[PDB]
Amino acid sequence: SGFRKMAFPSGKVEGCMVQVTCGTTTLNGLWLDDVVYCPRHVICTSEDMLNPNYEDLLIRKSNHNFLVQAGNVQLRVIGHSMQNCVLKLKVDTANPKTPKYKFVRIQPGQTFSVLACYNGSPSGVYQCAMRPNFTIKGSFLNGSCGSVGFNIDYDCVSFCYMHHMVLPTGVHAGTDLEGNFYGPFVDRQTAQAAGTDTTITVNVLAWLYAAVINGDRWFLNRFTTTLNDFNLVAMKYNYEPLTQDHVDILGPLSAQTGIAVLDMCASLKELLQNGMNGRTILGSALLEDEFTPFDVVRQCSGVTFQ
Amino acid sequence: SGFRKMAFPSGKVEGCMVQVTCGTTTLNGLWLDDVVYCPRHVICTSEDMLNPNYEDLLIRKSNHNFLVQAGNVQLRVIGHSMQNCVLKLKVDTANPKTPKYKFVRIQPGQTFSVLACYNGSPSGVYQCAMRPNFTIKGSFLNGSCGSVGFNIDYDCVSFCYMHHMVLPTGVHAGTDLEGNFYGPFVDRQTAQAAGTDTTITVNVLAWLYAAVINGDRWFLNRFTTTLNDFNLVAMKYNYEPLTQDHVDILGPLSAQTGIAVLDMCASLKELLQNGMNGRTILGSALLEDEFTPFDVVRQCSGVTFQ
Ligand SMILES: *[C@@](O)(c1nc2c(F)cccc2s1)[C@H](C[C@@H]1CCNC1=O)NC(=O)[C@@H]1[C@@H]2[C@H](CN1C(=O)[C@@H](NC(=O)C(F)(F)F)C(C)(C)C)C2(C)C
Ligand SMILES: *[C@@](O)(c1nc2c(F)cccc2s1)[C@H](C[C@@H]1CCNC1=O)NC(=O)[C@@H]1[C@@H]2[C@H](CN1C(=O)[C@@H](NC(=O)C(F)(F)F)C(C)(C)C)C2(C)C
């Protein structure tokens, strides 16, 4: 029983984490085959950061300027280049622990696991969601830069995120592993705020299905509603529109519980309108939106990896 | 920036997980050197579990009935003995990936990471607490038995929990790695109940301190209180009493915030009596008691491992 925010096992990724130093700046890098990936601002000092000229700072630099350490092993850089906001360092050793991997760009609402790192060493793991405003609600200190987010499919590690920065609200921003930002953010120290964040309705519904599977059923009402009427209400409350795709993704959970997605949609309509009256669902007193429908299925089926 | 329930990186433990089969009952095993630890009810069929005589059941068993899989590769069991409610299967191959490890019995209120496994394969990692009544609020499906809970100190893995059973409430119960239950439970299928569960006061205070460090300060008072006044409130709400040891344990957080423990107790007093009034704290609408003071120090100072 029970229902937790669960991260993927981190071992496959742990074996890929290294430390990259340029001058007096050190941050985390990701070592796959004979390439190390890190944030490009590794070449910046804390005063370059108001508005760097990366092309210019970079051209100055030579292979020998970049120190790569993997545990105790010093890695010899034999090449460097900049793709968007990431630096790729070609090294003389392929990482023997390199797992099957791919790089993906996740969409708003999708979850993944973060392995928070300081000085190339793993400190912690937790699950997050890409928020609709393209930020994440992570946990990161100074030196976290270059920590990575990922999903695991059996044996294939899909890397979706590398960490770059924290925004005034205390939420976070970063890139894909091709160094393109999620959202309209830039890698410089200047005024930038995320837009308004919305709640991810498809995930809330998934969460409500989890509750039902775990015996928490008090919020089921005898109404139903249409998708159009549902969405009119959800716009009112800063909830994301629900699509037909969302509906069909909820199917497994719908078929499991005997509860039509439009029925659950109606339970949710009432909760937004009248609130939760101090009552909890699965121990939470707020509606949770950082579990996808696949997340609920895996934790309510036993999906494993190796 | 940010406060999340963070788990320890799981790689060291992942390499120790095997699959243990006896009859057609399969569950999780922990392979350290040339010993594999699992729950002793691996030797039980369905009929046995209402009231097994483990001694008698085990006598009918022999090494030959014990099939240990380690990924794709079968392991030869050359020995066996029952230690309390756990089974020690001597195998022929020491585990090459054995980390430095110790076995510890944790106390109520202490947190640890769980690597949830099915069929000997990692599924997920998450953080929880030993509750005052010696249950945990985990996430476990059929086949989760023998999954383990752990802490990492630098390079040392301290194994503190092995999972055995779910209780009426949907809370879980298990043993240490020498097979002695946390709490009054037994490994048999009969109606058992945990005690009343209290809130871990020292952890709530640690979380409030995390709240202040992350800039969420609205619940601060200027009032104070003694330990005695506070305690005589606390027990009204089923908060565990707060001892001087707890005060001294909270002293790092106090010194970092500049807020005396007894002041913070005063803040918690008002919160217990006045409720939150629809206010959140670190984005929660309830008081969180599953972060120790050390946890708070770790994630607000960024301690690493491996
Ligand atoms: C990160 O780890 C990095 N730290 C350094 C560094 F010290 C020197 C050179 C390069 C880098 S990358 C760090 C992670 C931060 C620390 C606090 N919590 C985090 O998540 N990222 C940054 O310091 C980041 C880099 C410059 C300024 N950064 C910021 O996060 C700033 N925010 C903004 O400018 C805002 F996004 F607009 F709000 C800051 C310092 C928090 C105000 C750059 C963006 C390249
Ligand atoms: C666990 O994984 C094990 N499963 C088996 C099995 F199928 C055959 C033999 C041995 C074991 S151990 C499982 C974990 C449970 C399943 C559901 N959620 C979990 O956490 N543990 C049990 O099934 C466990 C074993 C017998 C009965 N168990 C219970 O958890 C039962 N509870 C109680 O008896 C009660 F707590 F008192 F209510 C049950 C089946 C959920 C009612 C034993 C303790 C030996």
Residue numbers in the entry:
A (entry chain B), B (entry chain A): 1 to 306
What's written in the study?
The present X-ray crystallographic and virologic study demonstrates how SARS-CoV-2's main protease (Mpro) inhibitor resistant variants emerge when SARS-CoV-2 is propagated in VeroE6TMPRSS2 cells under inhibitors’ selection pressure. The X-ray crystallography data with mass spectrometry data obtained in the present study clearly show that all three Mpro inhibitors specifically bind to the enzymatic active site of the enzyme through the formation of covalent, polar, (and halogen) binding interactions, causing the dimerization of two enzyme protomers. In conclusion, the present data show that the structural changes in the target enzyme (e.g., Mpro in the current work), which certain amino acid substitutions bring about, compromise the enzyme’s integrity (e.g., protomer dimerization and the following structural changes), loosen the binding of potential therapeutics to the enzyme and cause resistance.
We found that E166V substitution acquired in Mpro (MproE166V) disrupts the presumed Mpro-protomer-dimerization-initiating Ser1’-Glu166 interactions, loosens nirmatrelvir’s binding to Mpro’s active site, and compromises nirmatrelvir’s anti-SARS-CoV-2 activity. However, TKB245, a fluorinated-benzothiazole-containing Mpro inhibitor, stays bound to MproE166V’s active site and exerts substantial activity against MproE166V-carrying SARS-CoV-2, while that activity is less than that against the wild-type virus. To further examine whether the E166V substitution in the enzyme Mpro was responsible for the apparent resistance acquired against NIR and TKB245, we obtained two recombinant enzymes, MproWT and MproE166V. Instead, the structural changes that occurred with E166V substitution showed that the interactions between Ser1’ and Val166, and between Ser1’ and Phe140 were lost (6.7 and 7.1 Å or 4.9 and 6.0 Å, respectively).
